[PDB]
Design a protein around this ligand. Structure first.
Ligand code: HEC
Length: 108
């Protein structure tokens, strides 16, 4: 029950405002700026095995899931330091839930 009924529409724009530019998430799509995500939920990082990953994610390596994803957005700094990714944490948790829903839909 950690995930509540949220709407991806609100998170969809947040992704477009600060995520689509770096992550294409397109299926079989090429890699741009950051690695493409696809099924990363319930899986470990490095799945792309095609795009290099910051030493932190490689050495630290974290499991990605609906719960883990919320922690990444809440504090992406200490969570994965040493990477070229710099996303500001969102003070509102409700908005964060919608952002996860947008990528979660892509996993379908
Ligand atoms: C461009 C400036 C970025 C934006 C904005 C976002 N991400 Fe990113 N991300 C970026 C890079 C440089 C990397 C690769 C190096 C690394 O290991 O981090 C990443 C990586 C991720 C990952 C982890 C990699 C993996 O496990 O496969 C995740 C899951 C991730 N990024 C998520 C994410 C989200 C939630 C963002 C928008 C909502 C987002 N990133 C923006 C660069 C950039």
């Amino acid at each position: 029950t950690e995930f509540k009924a949220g709407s991806a529409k609100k998170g969809a724009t947040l992704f477009k405002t600060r995520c689509l530019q770096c992550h294409t998430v397109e299926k079989g799509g090429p890699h741009k700026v950051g690695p493409n995500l696809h099924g990363i939920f319930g899986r470990h990082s490095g799945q792309a095995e095609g795009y290099s990953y910051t030493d932190a994610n490689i050495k630290k390596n974290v499991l990605w899931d609906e719960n883990n994803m919320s922690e990444h957005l809440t504090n992406p700094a200490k969570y994965i330091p040493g990477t070229k990714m710099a996303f500001g944490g969102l003070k509102k948790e409700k908005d964060r839930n919608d952002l996860i829903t947008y990528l979660k839909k892509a996993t379908e």
